[PDB]
Amino acid sequence: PRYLKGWLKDVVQLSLRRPSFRASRQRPIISLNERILEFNKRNITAIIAEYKRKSPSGLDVERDPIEYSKFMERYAVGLSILTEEKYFNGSYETLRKIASSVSIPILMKDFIVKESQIDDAYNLGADTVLLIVKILTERELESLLEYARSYGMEPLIEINDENDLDIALRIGARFIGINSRDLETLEINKENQRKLISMIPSNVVKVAESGISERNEIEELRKLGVNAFLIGSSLMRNPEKIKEFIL
């Protein structure tokens, strides 16, 4: 991984030593990026609902994972499930239970730094994985992308600045997440997110992540070319809010 500091350095070391999970895939790969394109052509707002009980930028939320997932199966284009244990209180078992219960695409959200974590995602039933440009070197990123693709997954490659974007394009990314929140400082900067979105070629499927609390934001971003929206906290607090977001 890259030379990091703070909590990012810690979470990356945690992931390097993370043991793999013994499980066998029980479902087929249901492509998230392809379903997003499907929603775009039907003109249905595509929202990736995120499940996370804890995070460095919010208070804890207790909500049954299965009930949340079965509810979201009826409205969301897909689910983002946190599996990072220390800071987000996620787990492979929760992903496994959810993947066995719903049939919409599932993005495994973690800090992936080695191949076995992709094996874990595949074996647990996830349909794709998140790869974060700012914590990996260009060589590691391309290698993990190639590895995910060998399983049939098209990973969501998350960027936060121009340097990240340049690297994502150089490695042949086709599914890019533009995170308005800087993982290191936890700061949100929406102007920078809009600037990056406008620099991404139109043939790349774009996902706006973090800081969305109202439908009007979604509409504005959609006019800018954003294909899908990843929303966590507001839906965790009020799941029914998705009905308001998708009209």
Coordinates of all heavy atoms in Angstrom, one line a residue, residues 36 45-49 77 206-209 212 217-223 226-231:
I36 N -26.9 -0.5 -13.3 CA -27.0 1.0 -13.2 C -27.3 1.5 -14.6 O -28.2 2.4 -14.8 CB -25.6 1.6 -12.7 CG1 -25.4 1.3 -11.2 CG2 -25.6 3.1 -13.0 CD1 -24.1 1.7 -10.6
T45 N -34.0 6.6 -11.1 CA -32.9 7.1 -10.3 C -32.2 5.8 -9.7 O -32.9 5.0 -9.1 CB -33.4 8.0 -9.2 OG1 -34.0 9.2 -9.8 CG2 -32.2 8.5 -8.3
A46 N -30.9 5.7 -9.9 CA -30.2 4.5 -9.4 C -29.5 4.8 -8.1 O -28.5 5.5 -8.1 CB -29.2 4.0 -10.4
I47 N -30.0 4.3 -7.0 CA -29.4 4.5 -5.7 C -28.8 3.3 -5.1 O -29.5 2.2 -5.0 CB -30.5 5.1 -4.7 CG1 -30.9 6.5 -5.1 CG2 -29.9 5.1 -3.2 CD1 -32.0 7.0 -4.4
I48 N -27.5 3.3 -4.7 CA -26.9 2.2 -4.0 C -27.0 2.5 -2.5 O -26.5 3.5 -2.1 CB -25.4 2.1 -4.4 CG1 -25.2 2.1 -5.9 CG2 -24.8 0.9 -3.7 CD1 -23.7 2.3 -6.3
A49 N -27.8 1.7 -1.8 CA -28.1 1.9 -0.4 C -27.0 1.2 0.4 O -26.7 0.1 0.1 CB -29.4 1.2 0.0
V77 N -30.9 0.1 -6.6 CA -30.3 -0.5 -7.8 C -29.3 -1.6 -7.2 O -29.1 -2.6 -7.8 CB -29.5 0.5 -8.7 CG1 -28.2 1.0 -8.0 CG2 -29.2 -0.1 -10.0
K206 N -20.3 6.6 -13.7 CA -19.9 7.4 -12.5 C -20.9 7.3 -11.3 O -22.1 7.2 -11.5 CB -19.9 8.9 -13.0 CG -18.9 9.1 -14.1 CD -19.0 10.5 -14.7 CE -20.1 10.4 -15.8 NZ -19.7 9.5 -16.9
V207 N -20.4 7.1 -10.1 CA -21.2 7.0 -8.9 C -20.8 8.1 -7.9 O -19.6 8.2 -7.6 CB -20.9 5.6 -8.2 CG1 -21.7 5.5 -6.9 CG2 -21.2 4.5 -9.1
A208 N -21.7 9.0 -7.5 CA -21.4 10.1 -6.6 C -21.6 9.4 -5.2 O -22.5 8.7 -5.0 CB -22.4 11.2 -6.7
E209 N -20.6 9.6 -4.3 CA -20.6 9.1 -3.0 C -20.5 10.1 -1.9 O -19.8 11.1 -2.1 CB -19.4 8.1 -2.8 CG -19.3 6.9 -3.7 CD -18.1 6.1 -3.3 OE1 -17.0 6.3 -3.8 OE2 -18.3 5.1 -2.5
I212 N -25.0 13.1 0.5 CA -26.3 13.4 -0.1 C -27.4 13.2 0.9 O -27.5 12.2 1.5 CB -26.6 12.5 -1.3 CG1 -25.5 12.7 -2.4 CG2 -28.0 12.7 -1.9 CD1 -25.3 11.5 -3.3
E217 N -30.4 17.4 -4.6 CA -28.9 17.2 -4.9 C -28.8 16.1 -6.0 O -27.9 16.2 -6.8 CB -28.2 16.7 -3.6 CG -28.1 17.7 -2.6 CD -27.4 17.2 -1.4 OE1 -28.0 16.5 -0.5 OE2 -26.2 17.5 -1.3
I218 N -29.5 15.1 -5.9 CA -29.5 14.0 -6.8 C -29.8 14.5 -8.2 O -29.1 14.1 -9.2 CB -30.5 12.9 -6.4 CG1 -30.0 12.2 -5.1 CG2 -30.7 11.8 -7.5 CD1 -31.0 11.2 -4.5
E219 N -30.9 15.3 -8.4 CA -31.3 15.8 -9.7 C -30.2 16.7 -10.3 O -29.9 16.5 -11.5 CB -32.6 16.6 -9.6 CG -33.8 15.8 -10.1 CD -34.0 14.5 -9.5 OE1 -34.3 14.4 -8.3 OE2 -33.9 13.4 -10.2
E220 N -29.5 17.5 -9.5 CA -28.5 18.4 -10.0 C -27.3 17.5 -10.5 O -26.6 17.8 -11.5 CB -28.0 19.3 -8.9 CG -29.0 20.4 -8.5 CD -28.5 21.3 -7.4 OE1 -27.3 21.3 -7.1 OE2 -29.4 22.0 -6.8
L221 N -26.9 16.5 -9.7 CA -25.8 15.7 -10.1 C -26.1 14.9 -11.3 O -25.2 14.6 -12.1 CB -25.5 14.7 -8.9 CG -24.2 15.0 -8.0 CD1 -23.7 16.4 -8.2 CD2 -24.6 14.8 -6.6
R222 N -27.4 14.4 -11.4 CA -27.8 13.7 -12.6 C -27.7 14.5 -13.8 O -27.3 14.0 -14.9 CB -29.3 13.2 -12.4 CG -29.8 12.3 -13.4 CD -29.1 10.9 -13.4 NE -29.5 10.0 -14.5 CZ -28.7 9.7 -15.5 NH1 -27.5 10.1 -15.6 NH2 -29.2 8.9 -16.5
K223 N -27.9 15.8 -13.7 CA -27.8 16.7 -14.9 C -26.3 16.8 -15.3 O -26.0 17.2 -16.5 CB -28.4 18.1 -14.7 CG -27.7 19.0 -13.8 CD -28.1 20.4 -13.9 CE -27.8 21.2 -12.7 NZ -26.4 21.1 -12.3
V226 N -23.9 12.1 -13.6 CA -23.7 11.1 -12.7 C -24.7 10.0 -12.9 O -25.9 10.2 -13.1 CB -23.8 11.6 -11.2 CG1 -23.7 10.5 -10.2 CG2 -22.8 12.7 -11.0
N227 N -24.3 8.7 -13.0 CA -25.1 7.6 -13.3 C -25.8 7.0 -12.1 O -27.0 6.5 -12.2 CB -24.3 6.4 -14.0 CG -23.6 6.9 -15.2 OD1 -22.5 7.3 -15.2 ND2 -24.3 6.8 -16.4
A228 N -25.2 6.9 -10.9 CA -25.7 6.3 -9.7 C -25.3 7.1 -8.5 O -24.3 7.9 -8.5 CB -25.4 4.9 -9.6
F229 N -25.9 6.9 -7.3 CA -25.7 7.6 -6.1 C -25.5 6.6 -4.9 O -26.4 5.7 -4.8 CB -26.8 8.6 -5.8 CG -27.1 9.5 -7.0 CD1 -28.0 9.0 -8.0 CD2 -26.5 10.7 -7.2 CE1 -28.1 9.8 -9.2 CE2 -26.6 11.5 -8.3 CZ -27.5 11.0 -9.3
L230 N -24.4 6.7 -4.2 CA -24.2 5.8 -3.0 C -24.6 6.6 -1.8 O -24.0 7.7 -1.5 CB -22.8 5.3 -3.0 CG -22.5 4.1 -2.2 CD1 -21.1 3.5 -2.5 CD2 -22.6 4.4 -0.7
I231 N -25.6 6.2 -1.1 CA -26.1 6.9 0.1 C -26.2 6.0 1.3 O -26.7 4.9 1.2 CB -27.6 7.5 -0.2 CG1 -27.5 8.4 -1.5 CG2 -28.1 8.3 1.0 CD1 -28.8 9.0 -1.8

